[PDB]
Design a protein around this nucleic acid. Structure first.
Length: 51
DNA sequence: AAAAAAAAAAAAAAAAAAAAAAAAAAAAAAAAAAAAAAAAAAAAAAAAA
């Protein structure tokens, strides 16, 4: 449920760190499930409890 | 000479079998539906006119 602009904001906040968004056989960003968790953990979306 | 008694006979009654008829069951189809499998059109990502 993250709009494209929100997801680009999240990856602009995240990617400059040491993390690399692992790509599959192609360049397509193959964000692992844990990668997605971390991304939206620090993306700024409050959890169902922390909100 | 005639009567009665005795003996060798047809007709009716009872039981079983073979013809046929109807219904039900096994089967043996030609047709359809559902599920499965083998390709395809908008969106997304990175390096470069």
């Amino acid at each position: 449920g993250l709009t494209r602009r929100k997801l680009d904001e999240a990856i602009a906040k995240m990617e400059e760190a040491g993390h690399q968004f692992t790509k599959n056989n192609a360049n397509h960003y193959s964000i692992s499930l844990s990668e997605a968790h971390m991304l939206m953990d620090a993306a700024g979306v409050p959890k169902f409890h922390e909100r």
